[PDB]
Amino acid sequence: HSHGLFKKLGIPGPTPLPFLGNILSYHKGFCMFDMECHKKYGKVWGFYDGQQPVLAITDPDMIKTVLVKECYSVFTNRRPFGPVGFMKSAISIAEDEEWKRLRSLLSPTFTSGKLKEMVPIIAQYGDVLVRNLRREAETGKPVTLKDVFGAYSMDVITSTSFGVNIDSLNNPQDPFVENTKKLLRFDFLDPFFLSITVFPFLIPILEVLNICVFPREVTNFLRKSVKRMKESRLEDTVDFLQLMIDSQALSDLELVAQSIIFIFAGYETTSSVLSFIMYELATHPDVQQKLQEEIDAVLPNKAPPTYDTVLQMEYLDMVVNETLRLFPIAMRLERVCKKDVEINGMFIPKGVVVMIPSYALHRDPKYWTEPEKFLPERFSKKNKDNIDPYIYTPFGSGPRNCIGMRFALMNMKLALIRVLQNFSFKPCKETQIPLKLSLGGLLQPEKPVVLKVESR
Ligand code: HEM
Ligand SMILES: CC[C@@H](CC[C@H](CC)NC(=O)[C@H](CO)NC(=O)N(C)Cc1csc(C(C)C)n1)NC(=O)OCc1cncs1
């Protein structure tokens, strides 16, 4: 048993059980477990995912060292998670040299120039989202946001990876829609991933059986989807595909891996955050009116948002950020400790997963006044400098942060601008209040957010 380590290092934690470790404590969610631990062990503590020692850390300096300083030398990778197949090459999964190589090649993809070039595209599906919303605002029946936002999010993804101009909501049965939709993942507390942690010694076994967490089903029709366009569309002579093609040491059957992860990364994420935001504005009509006014002051007479226009919206940026404080989609940030180290006084042995509890740190009394309340003013220029960048980490930090940050932000904002210009979102009878979060390992709502939509 490796279960003696935190006792021996003099680190407090909940007492692990044989084989299971502390996993049974997840029955309440990463979220309440991390908050409880913080509350009763203080700044630093230790637990076991099966036989895997995880060290939680909460000190801004120490986090900065793990996330930003010793990233390259010591804390380079995330923890392996289950049988991954060819997706071992995807940037967010890759390790060491291979990761450093991929992050360089793909960095040019997420530049402001490429992003400004992507505006007219993502924006054009703002109009579709509106159109679509306009029909359902005439029904007067509760809208399921995550579904309307889902279609928008797919729509924006497809289009910025080799223009696949699909009206995703109203082409429910299109090859690109059906596959992509199914790439809704991953819950690391579901039955499957649970066993993966009580039995990591089973991963080698499933890998050799070709069993993959990214279901073979989906990855198949994308490997093949990509193969023909990549060859045909530029044989006759503005998207991630092109940007990728041009920069060719980037292997063929690694480009597919990047392509899949950008779908898997923006699809469920952009749509979830957006839902959480529209929930927040509905249950906060004041904020929503304040927002609609900012937008109308900047873009008078429903004028179409632009790149520069979007950045100019102080209050929009504040609403987005607050929503991310309350519902960070990562929940935790993790790095594997590559060799023995001494960071800000304390010793980390090689092999330990070092873990920063974002969801918990985002809700900590030491840093936030009335931390349960949705209050966008915390992010106004008056108060924002009191906000520590290593407590508030919705996009991680350091060399291994979210490569898609500015794209995520811009995308989401463009959706909000076009949507708020045209509609108001009011809660109805089916709407859950206060919103309850899911007990799983994906931070999402128990019941899908349903809201009344009214035409301005
Ligand atoms: C609102 C939506 C999003 C949120 C809240 C978000 C947040 C994050 C967070 C917290 C990390 C971990 C960083 C760390 O360990 O410090 C991350 C990693 C990453 N994200 Fe984003 N993300 C979002 C959307 C995107 C989009 C749109 C893309 C690209 C299309 C993207 C691509 C990545 C990649 C490739 C990594 C791993 C980076 C690496 O290992 O080098 N995510 N995301
Ligand atoms: C394939 C899993 C995951 C890899 C990296 C993400 C980044 C947010 N990691 C996570 O934070 C997610 C939680 O939503 N999962 C994890 O926390 N892990 C990968 C670690 C893990 C694996 S098992 C476990 C339990 C047993 C304690 N923890 N997704 C992924 O590929 O990133 C695409 C995205 C980019 N931006 C937002 S999502």
With helix as H, strand as E and coil as C, how does 233-257 read?
HHHHCCCHHHHHHHCCCCCHHHHHH
Q: Which ligand is nearest to the CA of 270?
A: 1
Enter the DSSP assignment of 93. T
CA 50 to chain centre: 25
Q: Are 106 and 91 in contact (CB under 8 A)?
A: yes
Give distance in angstroms: CA of 394 to centre of ligand 1: 9
Give distance in angstroms: CA of 402 to centre of ligand 1: 3
Q: Which ligand is nearest to the CA of 109?
A: 1
Method of elucidation: X-ray
Question: 402: annotated binding-site residue?
Answer: yes
What tokens appear for 246 in the block? Answer: 């041009």
Contacts of 317 (CB under 8 A, 6+ apart): 379, 413
Mutational test site, ligand 2, from 23, 48, 78, 240, max ligand atoms within 8 Å of CB: 78
CB-based burial label for 346 (10 Å; 0-12, 13-18, 19+)? middle
Residue identifier of the C-alpha nearest atom 32 of ligand 2: 265
Q: Which atom of ligand 1 is nearest to the CA of 240?
A: 30
Give distance in angstroms: CA of 404 to centre of ligand 1: 6
Q: Are 332 and 364 in contact (CB under 8 A)?
A: no
Q: Where are the alpha helices (DSSP H) in 17-144?
A: 29-41, 60-64, 96-106, 112-136
Q: Which atom of ligand 2 is nearest to the CA of 442?
A: 14
Query: CA nearest 49: which of 354, 407, 307, 260?
Result: 354
Residue identifier of the C-alpha nearest atom 6 of ligand 1: 395
Quote the Cα angle for 111-115-118, to 5°: 145
Say how far apart CA 311 and CA 112 lie, in whole Å. Answer: 12
Ligand 2 pocket, residue 402 CB under 6 Å: yes
Q: Which ligand is nearest to the CA of 335?
A: 1
Say how far apart CA 135 and CA 5 lie, in whole Å. Answer: 60
Mapped onto helix, strand or coil, the DSSP state of residue 389 is: coil
Give distance in angstroms: CA of 333 to centre of ligand 2: 8
Q: Are 174 and 135 in contact (CB under 8 A)?
A: no
Residue identifier of the C-alpha nearest atom 35 of ligand 1: 92
Order of strands across the sheet with 450-455? 143-144, 450-455, 423-427
Give distance in angstroms: CA of 331 to centre of ligand 2: 9
Contacts of 416 (CB under 8 A, 6+ apart): 274, 277, 291, 316, 319, 320
What tokens appear for 294 in the block? Answer: 């900012």
Give distance in angstroms: CA of 330 to centre of ligand 2: 7
Write 150-154 long-range contacts (CB < 8 A, 24+): 150/181, 150/267, 150/271, 152/125, 152/126, 152/128, 152/271, 152/274, 152/415, 153/266, 153/267, 153/268, 153/270, 153/271, 153/274, 154/180, 154/181, 154/267
Quote the Cα angle for 416-417-420, to 5°: 75
> What residues are in contact with ligand 1 under a 6 Å CB criterion?
91-92, 103, 261-262, 265-266, 269-270, 273, 329-330, 333, 394-397, 400-404, 407-408
Enter the DSSP assignment of 133. H
Topology at the third CATH level for domain 1-456: Cytochrome p450 (1.10.630)
Angle formed by the axes of helices 405-422 and 145-159, nearest 10° = 130
Provide the β-strand partners of residue 346: 343
Residue identifier of the C-alpha nearest atom 30 of ligand 1: 262
Q: Which ligand is nearest to the CA of 189?
A: 2
Enter the DSSP assignment of 65. I
Resolution of the model in angstroms: 2.6
